[PDB]
Structure 1
């Protein structure tokens, strides 16, 4: 109550955590909360999935492997981890995260250090 710095820090850290959960999920320290925008677009009218998944697939199909010993999330389910699409036509991708703000640059860390997409 008598120290404003801790109050400010906690408030702003909570704001960042909540907004990260809403928009792009939370993966820093061993915790993973799926981005709620992705889940909402998955569960609604004919499904729209991450544009980030499409860019990750495209950068996979050419070469250098992205860091992270996992796979893109293909939907909402327990450990619904996959790298590919079903036999019918591919998913209906879209710029899901543009509605909450244009980002103008996406950073991807591939398997070896010191180079980034």
Structure 2
């Protein structure tokens, strides 16, 4: 799986919107795979990876063109999942 952030950036670049960044979106794990296009045979497998560690409402992408930014809104695609508490609990004792 590749996180939805990768395809969010790719879709926005597919339109006449250019995003701020010196490095291309990261693909895979290797040290330098900053690529904009999927490998070759077919597109990567994508999923909403960041949901399992806490559901958000908006994704802000902050276009390079100043004083304007792109907002991606997350909705449950049928009103079933409105929130999700993070499943990790941090504890501080002594």
TM-score by length of 1: 0.58
Which of structures 1 and 2 has the larger relative contact order (alpha carbons within 8 angstroms, sep 6+)? Answer: 2
Equivalents in 1 of 2:5, 2:16: separation in Å? 17
Match of 2:45 in 1: 92
User: What 5-or-longer segments of structure 1 have no aligned partner?
Assistant: 1-47
CA distance in 2, matches of 1:63, 1:101: 31
Gaps of 5+ in 2: 71-94
Task: Give the corresponding residue for 2:63.
Answer: 110
**Which secondary structure does the structure 2 equivalent of 1:114 belong to?**
coil
Who is 1:57 aligned against? Answer: 10
Structure 1 position 66 matched with structure 2 position 14: no
CA RMSD between the two structures? 0.8
Q: Confirm whether residue 82 of structure 1 aligns to residue 32 of structure 2.
A: no
Whole-angstrom distance in 1 between the partners of 2:37 and 2:8: 13
TM superposition shift of 1:78: 1.3
Structure 1 residue 66 displacement after superposition = 0.6
- Matched positions, count: 70
What's the TM-score once normalised by structure 2's chain length? 0.71
